[PDB]
Structure formats: structure tokens, C-alpha cells
Amino acid sequence: APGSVVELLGKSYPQDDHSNLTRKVLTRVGRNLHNQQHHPLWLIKERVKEHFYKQYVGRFGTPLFSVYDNLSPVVTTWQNFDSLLIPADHPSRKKGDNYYLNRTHMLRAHTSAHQWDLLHAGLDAFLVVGDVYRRDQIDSQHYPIFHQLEAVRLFSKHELFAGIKDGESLQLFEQSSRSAHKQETHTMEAVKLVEFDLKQTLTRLMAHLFGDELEIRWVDCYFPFTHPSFEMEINFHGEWLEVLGCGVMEQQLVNSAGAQDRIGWAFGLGLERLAMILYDIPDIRLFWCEDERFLKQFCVSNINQKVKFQPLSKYPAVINDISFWLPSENYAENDFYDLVRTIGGDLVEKVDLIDKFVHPKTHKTSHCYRITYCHMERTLSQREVRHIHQALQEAAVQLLGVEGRF
Ligand SMILES: N[C@@H](Cc1ccccc1)C(=O)O
């Protein structure tokens, strides 16, 4: 029966109460833009690889980062969440925000879903590069599929302290208390040196990519799988924008994988955000077009070329509002955004939820959304926008159970 199973790459996934993949999102699996020669996301991947191969120093010799850029994005919820100490009630698990094949399997929402497995295989240094998947809003800075680069680097005790003359007393581990600055089983000596290595390598990487005009800052933050943790923000177009999260790996995670004689750092870089800043790319949909006007601008002889995408003129937009009554107590905005992606695809530039109200006589909730139809590569005709918008109205009633207003 329709809707009972999803098949992907030869495997079958029975559908249940968690299942929420759209056909549209599934058609993106395997595209692997980060492996497409000359693609801007591939360019960033290659430049990061070169950084660690040529410009990262280790006191015992540079670790050698093995690179995994072709792992299937289908993961278990154990890989994506439990292995990273993400609590069962954590909002990052909500059905509204993740593409679940079912209660047990999902499309990975982050490349951190592979940390535990690669640590458990015994690696001390690795990169993971891949497409990741999240349910989210529609605008020029958000897409249901994007790409991350994960890095993990572990140190042994004498490796971390190798530059210290009287360092035989120094330890990685102790039994004390957790503070804002360190985990309960880490010494402050070890945390300071791991943090220094992590921030130094990331600063050097960004300085190479952007030059020394770059304005960056570190923001103290929280993740369940690192502590202390930071985000790096870059000041771009007058605002501070996060480009990566990182930190000192939680020792329970590292110990659980079998590396109890190691302390580590890890980071996760958003490739599209970096590429949009670095290359003057104004809209995330451009990564997904095959327009030779776009792809030819990144075919460079040296991966370190300072290319500046020259954008096309903006084409005219058609703006249409759409309003409906929500079903009785079963609806997420992201269900509508998924349907917009399904029907309108890359014709849709942005969707804003403008108005919401409750009607007293019926107790129903009305939403009104504003849809900006504007294509990156061509002028949309009024007629074709009308036909797409009509299809959207009809699909919302049929599939989401809404009752149309206008
Ligand atoms: N996985 C985190 C980023 C991260 C990776 C590794 C360590 C810390 C943070 C994210 O997707 O936002």
C-alpha cells in the first residue's frame, strides 16, 4: 500500500508515526555536491583537507586525518543522538525538525552522527564531509539539505604535554567538578592546551581562506557532546554569523568508544555558510543549479584561487499570500514548508508566516503565509506562478488537511 514503506539504496524502511520524508528530499540523496569536482562546496572541502595535510603541526608528528566523504546519510537515532549524549527529551529530536525514515532510522542532521563509530574503529584523527538534512524555514539562507565538515582530533597524555620540560607530573584526567570551564574528569592543564590547539588551528584555517582582513570572534556556547564549547562567528554584511561549532569532546563519549587514554577536540563546519561568505554567493539555491553561468566560475587551476562569483541580475518576483484553517490539533509550520518545497521547488525564494489567529466561534486556528516566487535563473511568468500556487492550495487541503481561506 502507498506510504507503507520507503526504499532507498536497496534498503527498505517500514513507515510509522515518526516517518516524515518527502519524495522531494529523497531525490537529493546521493547528489553529493561536496564530491563534485570544481563545485564550491568541494572546493572548500579540498582546501580544509590541504590545511590539515600541509599546515597542521603535531608534536609527535601530524596525526594524518583520514577523510570520509561518501558515508550514506541514513543513520540510526542512536548514531545521530544517543551516541552524542543528546537527552531523550531534547528539542533537537523533534519530528518537526528532522527527516525520520521511521522511529529508528533518519537522514543524519549533522556529521557528528559518525563521531562514535569512527572513534570506535580506533582513529585518532578524521574528517567527515557530507550532506545533512533538517526540516526548516524557506529563505535564501536555508535549504533542507546542506553540507558539513566534521573534524575530530585526539591527543595522548605525553603528546599533549610534549613541549614541557618538567611535565611528567601533568595529567589529562582527575576526579573533580564540572565548571563553566571544564568537565569533571579533565584537568585544567589539559583543557587549556586542547582549547589552544583547537582555536589556533581554526583561526589559521580561516585566515588562509579569507586573508587577514577577516573579523572573527569566539562565542561560548553549549552542546551535549562537547564541553567547554564554542561557536566561531564571522562578521559579514554588518552582522555576526555563526560558521562552526566546536569544543573539547565529552569524555563519556570518548570513553564509550574505547579511547579512554585520549582527550579530544571536535568541530563541525557549515559548508554553505562558509561558501556564501567566501565566494559572494547570495542565495543557497545556487549550489543546486546546473547553470553553466554559475559552475564555470569555480573551475580553477589552484584550489586556493580567490574567486568572486558574479551574480546575475535579480529577476522579478511574484508575491502571493495563502491562508487556511489548521487541522484539529495536528500541524507544524515545517509540514507546510516541506509541501512548498515539493510543489514549488526552487521557484520559491522565501515563505513568511505573516498572521495567525483563533476564531472564537469555531476554536480553529488560521495561518496566513506570504510566498515569494522568484527564480534565480529566469523570469517566472504570471501564468506559471498561478499554476504552481493553485497546485499548492490544492495539495495543502489534500495532504495537510487544511481548510482553505484564500
Ligand atoms: N554538530 C554540531 C556542530 C558541532 C560539531 C562538533 C563539535 C561541536 C559542535 C552542529 O551541527 O551544530
Residue numbers in the entry: 10 to 415
What did the publication describing this PDB structure actually write?
Mutations in the mitochondrial aminoacyl‐tRNA synthetases (mtaaRSs) can cause profound clinical presentations, and have manifested as diseases with very selective tissue specificity. Among the recently reported pathogenic variants are point mutations in FARS2 gene, encoding the human mitochondrial PheRS. Patient symptoms range from spastic paraplegia to fatal infantile Alpers encephalopathy. How clinical manifestations of these mutations relate to the changes in three‐dimensional structures and kinetic characteristics remains unclear, although impaired aminoacylation has been proposed as possible etiology of diseases.
Here, we report four crystal structures of HsmtPheRS mutants, and extensive MD simulations for wild‐type and nine mutants to reveal the structural changes on dynamic trajectories of HsmtPheRS. Using steady‐state kinetic measurements of phenylalanine activation and tRNAPhe aminoacylation, we gained insight into the structural and kinetic effects of mitochondrial disease‐related mutations in FARS2 gene.
